[PDB]
Amino acid sequence: GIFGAIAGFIEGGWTGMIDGWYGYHHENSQGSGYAADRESTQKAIDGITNKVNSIINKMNTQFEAVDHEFSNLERRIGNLNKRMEDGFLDVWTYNAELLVLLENERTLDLHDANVKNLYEKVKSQLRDNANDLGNGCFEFWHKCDNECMESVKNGTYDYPKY
Amino acid sequence: GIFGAIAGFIEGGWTGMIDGWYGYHHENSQGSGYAADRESTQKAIDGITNKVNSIINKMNTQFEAVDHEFSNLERRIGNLNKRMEDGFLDVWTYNAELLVLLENERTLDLHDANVKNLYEKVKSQLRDNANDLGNGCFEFWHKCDNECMESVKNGTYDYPKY
Amino acid sequence: GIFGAIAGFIEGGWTGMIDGWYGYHHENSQGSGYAADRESTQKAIDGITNKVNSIINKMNTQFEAVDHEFSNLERRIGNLNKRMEDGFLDVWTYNAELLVLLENERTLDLHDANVKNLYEKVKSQLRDNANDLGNGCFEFWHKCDNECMESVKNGTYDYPKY
Amino acid sequence: DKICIGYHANNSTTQVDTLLEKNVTVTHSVELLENQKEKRFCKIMNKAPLDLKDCTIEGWILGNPKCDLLLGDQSWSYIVERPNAQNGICYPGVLNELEELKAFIGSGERVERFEMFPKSTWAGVDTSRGVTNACPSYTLDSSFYRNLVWLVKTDSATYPVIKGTYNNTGTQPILYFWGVHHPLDTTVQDNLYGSGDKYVRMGTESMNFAKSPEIAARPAVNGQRSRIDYYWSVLRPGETLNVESNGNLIAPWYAYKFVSTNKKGAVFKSDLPIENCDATCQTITGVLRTNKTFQNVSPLWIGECPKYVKSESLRLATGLRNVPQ
Amino acid sequence: DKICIGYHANNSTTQVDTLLEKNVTVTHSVELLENQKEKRFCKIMNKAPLDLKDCTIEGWILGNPKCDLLLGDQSWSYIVERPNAQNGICYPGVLNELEELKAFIGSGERVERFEMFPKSTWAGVDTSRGVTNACPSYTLDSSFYRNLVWLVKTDSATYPVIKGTYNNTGTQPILYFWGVHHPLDTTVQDNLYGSGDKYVRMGTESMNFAKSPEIAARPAVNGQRSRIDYYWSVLRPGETLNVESNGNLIAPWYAYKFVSTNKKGAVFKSDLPIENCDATCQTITGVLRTNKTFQNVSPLWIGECPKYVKSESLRLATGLRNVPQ
Amino acid sequence: DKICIGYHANNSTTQVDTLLEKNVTVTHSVELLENQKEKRFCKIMNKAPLDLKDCTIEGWILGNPKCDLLLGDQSWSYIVERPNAQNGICYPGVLNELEELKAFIGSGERVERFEMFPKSTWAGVDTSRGVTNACPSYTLDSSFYRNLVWLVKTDSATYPVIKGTYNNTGTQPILYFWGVHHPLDTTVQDNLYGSGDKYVRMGTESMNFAKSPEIAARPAVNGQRSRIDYYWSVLRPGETLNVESNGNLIAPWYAYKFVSTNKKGAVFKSDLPIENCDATCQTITGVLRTNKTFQNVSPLWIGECPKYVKSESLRLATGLRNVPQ
Numbered sequence A, B, C: 001g002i003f004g005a006i007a008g009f010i011e012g013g014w015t016g017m018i019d020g021w022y023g024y025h026h027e028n029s030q031g032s033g034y035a036a037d038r039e040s041t042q043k044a045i046d047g048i049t050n051k052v053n054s055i056i057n058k059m060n061t062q063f064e065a066v067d068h069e070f071s072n073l074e075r076r077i078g079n080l081n082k083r084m085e086d087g088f089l090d091v092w093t094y095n096a097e098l099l100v101l102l103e104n105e106r107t108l109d110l111h112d113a114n115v116k117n118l119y120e121k122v123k124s125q126l127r128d129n130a131n132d133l134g135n136g137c138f139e140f141w142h143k144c145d146n147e148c149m150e151s152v153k154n155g156t157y158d159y160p161k162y
Numbered sequence D, E, F: 001d002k003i004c005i006g007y008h009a010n011n012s013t014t015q016v017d018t019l020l021e022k023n024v025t026v027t028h029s030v031e032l033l034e035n036q037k038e039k040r041f042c043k044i045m046n047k048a049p050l051d052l053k054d055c056t057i058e059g060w061i062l063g064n065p066k067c068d069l070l071l072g073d074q075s076w077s078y079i080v081e082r083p084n085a086q087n088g089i090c091y092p093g094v095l096n097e098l099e100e101l102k103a104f105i106g107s108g109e110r111v112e113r114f115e116m117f118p119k120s121t122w123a124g125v126d127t128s129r130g131v132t133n134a135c136p137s138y139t140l141d142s143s144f145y146r147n148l149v150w151l152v153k154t155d156s157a158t159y160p161v162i163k164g165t166y167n168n169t170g171t172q173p174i175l176y177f178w179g180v181h182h183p184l185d186t187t188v189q190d191n192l193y194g195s196g197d198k199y200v201r202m203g204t205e206s207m208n209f210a211k212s213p214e215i216a217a218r219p220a221v222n223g224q225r226s227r228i229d230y231y232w233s234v235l236r237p238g239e240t241l242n243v244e245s246n247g248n249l250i251a252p253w254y255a256y257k258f259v260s261t262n263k264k265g266a267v268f269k270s271d272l273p274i275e276n277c278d279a280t281c282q283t284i285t286g287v288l289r290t291n292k293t294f295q296n297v298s299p300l301w302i303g304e305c306p307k308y309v310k311s312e313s314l315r316l317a318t319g320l321r322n323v324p325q
Ligand SMILES: *[C@@H]1O[C@H](CO)[C@@H](O[C@@H]2O[C@H](CO)[C@@H](O[C@@H]3O[C@H](CO)[C@@H](O)[C@H](O)[C@@H]3O)[C@H](O)[C@H]2NC(C)=O)[C@H](O)[C@H]1NC(C)=O
Pocket: A146, A147, A148, A150, A151, A154, A156
């Protein structure tokens, strides 16, 4: 991934976070847990759903081959028909296969970017008050209970306290 | 946006900066004002103008449908002509509509990246000497008059002073 | 480049680093030298080789024009043949030329991203222990011999020492 | 106390390809291509197809006596012709503009058989002896096409000029057939039509036809060295057909009121079974039941089908790179 | 003291679509598609089109007496045929290879009418009585095509062999017409051409023609049960045409020196008004005046037109996401 | 002590274009298009092409006496016809369905000439005097096609009915030719075939032919005002051909056992030299020797060629932006 987060500085995924694409693992006195970031997950779901549907809609025409026959004295127009039908078959096979390879690459980059930005949103809030361990984890210099955790996730962390 | 600046950590645009795409708002003893960064704005204008023109040039051929008629005993070649004309109409409608959706997405990412890099160029110059507020603004720890401001914008800010 | 490293905050390339695409220049008591980062270079070589080969494979069909002749009373089907052959020639010229312009842009961004991430991998390891000069160089606050240098490059730099 | 940023992994082994990398396992993905068919023919728009069974298109539409099963009115969503159908043109000869006829019939939806020229149309000729052992029915060993009548000479008085007329006063075009007989020698000619230069002439407001017998011995086919030149045309609404001949006329007896289709029209040459089922999408090699966008089953279909493509797979990534730990 | 990094917003409500998102407001954008036409026909390359008005292509080029307005030399950038034009083939019959003729004429730019065979070409026949009430002019109620001559028999002496010759010694190909008459019965035949087997034969260095009258009563059209088989050909530079006939010949009188176009050529079937204006791009449904790359007006045009496409809109983003505050 | 992160630069001046920027120098790149040809014809699959030299396709396959170099069996990977070849149809006339014949022959790989009807096939006619000064050989000034025989009348007894038969009992289709003579006047007709209505009739299990002479003086070509209507057909395995005629028959003498190609087939009209070399890819304007994906040399080729495209260049970036310092 060109953004460097997925299978990058965050080496692996979380099979434990089952309720979304991107999110958090917190650990404090009340214990541990996974939680999806629903805003960035839902935004990605909408974008990718839109992309799938747009591809499906642009591909919703069909070239129609026909059953028509040609006599032994119509070799030229019979072959013209074959070469044309094959002609369109090749451009649409090309269009579909190339599009999928291109879209797949960009889709993975999209997810990679979103994890990166999520990581940046958190680093930007905490600043001095946490230690960035280099792997997507932050160690707080102060006690962070459940409302503190939740204010980091909803993007309203209150730095001047603590 | 995958780079996270436009409608991201910089939440909104500036209707007050009318003379360019990306730029600055400064505030010191001499007052306030907007100024475009002309280097990054012009570079983007050239790139996007090039992209528009390249699309226009690649689309500067035309498939030519014809007026030719076919008798009641030429149903096969008449239908061959129709299916071919419709065939090319569908691939070009596909090519144009898909290209525009793809290019639009990447164009918005381009602008998003450029704002991000502009923000990085400034953060990199100031270092210790300013406080990053998390929204694209930096609060100086020292007095920054108009020449100081202008040296930040032209990328020659002199850290060892002040 | 949208990631801001190549011909960006790292202003130029190194003609002295001949053995790879991305890498390092170190300078300590034992002297100076260039070394490629083989992991990120090889990963890029594989990706780009895959991209070239995928393009070559998707383009490995051919529309076949024919030698067939048409009498003076076959102006309609002769012209149908011409317009169809020209029709496919135009879509494939379009497909090839557009693809190359698009792939070239994204390829340069790929390299640009990889240099950026390489720079981030190093900044993340060193932290306090080096001064980021803003141009892709880090000045160590401690002596860094050859094994220290090599541990930065292989991503096992040991911060708690020194 | 710590908070970590991370991403979803799961038990997926499903892979996609990208420009940069093959065989990448992703958490979620969607396949856009269908490679699955039901190997049979079904109804389309809840209308049944027409099975020709042991009759070819020509045998069916000419009224080959061994195609009586098909004889009459038909409605079809499409036509299925069996590869080994034996009942076509039984009396040797060429059906002219055969490929255009097939295309015409393929563009149709329904035919109504009706009597166009009763045998009593043709004054002073015999209409009851025009049979042949090249055209057996399932009972008689010498019959003839149910839609044509082989007119021969009476007692021995000379083959007079016969005449027929039909004004198409209906709303539908009429598909009809006729022929010209070409005996192998001049005595067979004389035995059937008498002496003199013979002609078959035919005309509407927009069509002209004129031909003479071309007497010659051709290689034997179904026991005949003679030939028939079969023809077809379409009488448009408001048009009128005049027939004039003094011999060698295979006359139009029955014809077809023809309903052209609003849809597409298909003629499938296949061995596949026709069954009692519904479908929205029918290809020549089977039924597709999908919501998918592409298919690699067949370029040839009737109904609402996905785009045909030569690809084995078109799997689109939706989720992210699967990196479980 | 502070400095902020930011981006442009404005009052734009113009939106674009992307793969990820519909209806995104952007600060700047450009529309690539034209959906606007001027509903009229104009000059192309400052050359005017040819309006056929109440004449069809056949009536014009055969010299139908009611098409005298068009008669003679013409230059055109394209041709406009009106849907309800009544003046075509007045004496019933088929123009052979009609669709190829239209394609030929469509590839042209200019015709020069000239006399190819003066009536005095044909020795021993009448050239002054070949008229018909099926071909009225605007004055006479019985006339005939200005480019053909219906040759009939004189006093009553037998229809001799007539002969004509033209060596094309010019630089341009010649478009010319001729016919074969088919009377309804044998007495009309005799009254006009006398007895005996009749023929019409025609030949150049590269073309052969031979046909006989086919006597039969066809349904009446414009009061005639007879027919004419109209033909056309092109005499190439250096080629020579020989005509030989002993009856039933509708002779070539006037013909056309033909200038083939370097451009494309169009024949527009339309009702749209022709006006006094210029254009670089003319479609069948109107004029386009644009610099834009695509258009969804028509696939059918003459001139320099944008690519035809079925899209309502193709708006390209140039500026960025509009987020005013 | 310091460590720096950086990237490769080199001495490259090779440039690529991108959507955002033209003329970008990159460290590494690959060109995908070939613009280079060897201006000659070579072997394909180590099989040689057939050079027609001074003979056209018609002259070769009809057996024009000046094409004896080519006469007999041939095997070819493709055919080269020279633009200025003078030896085609020497006795004036039209080869019917000429374009279909060329397409047929183009789909082939090998012909075997064999005698199909020995001259002794035709009872009671002269087979030794059918020559003409329009068809000189390189020795005789009056010869005729090696594959046809111009049958004329003997002493003066009347042109009897002649008959020929060939059952194709082999595994390959047979390409054969025949003609109908059209004298300029009725005395030349009488001098060669005698009086009476003449015919040429021909038939197989699937083909019928019938034509009469059409006597008329056409413009002189190679010193002849007469004409021949040349025809061709293909006798399929298992089929039998019957010939019947009483005059004006240009008879089939020799024919060709035809081997259809599994590959593509090409007929190149070119002046390029044929040389002693191998190739996998041969275009009409030269040989391509490449591994590249595209080419802008020609859309017309035989062999395994790269995709034809109108582009001057298709250079793909692989390395990065070249910024040496
Ligand atoms: C983001 O998360 C933070 C932390 O969960 C949210 O702040 C919390 O807001 C609730 C009320 O919405 C506060 O509870 C209140 O406490 C008082 C007693 O002091 C009680 O009388 C009220 O009825 C109510 O229960 C809670 O203290 C506060 N947590 C803090 C300040 O740490 C915040 O609202 C969230 N924002 C969004 C946009 O979701």
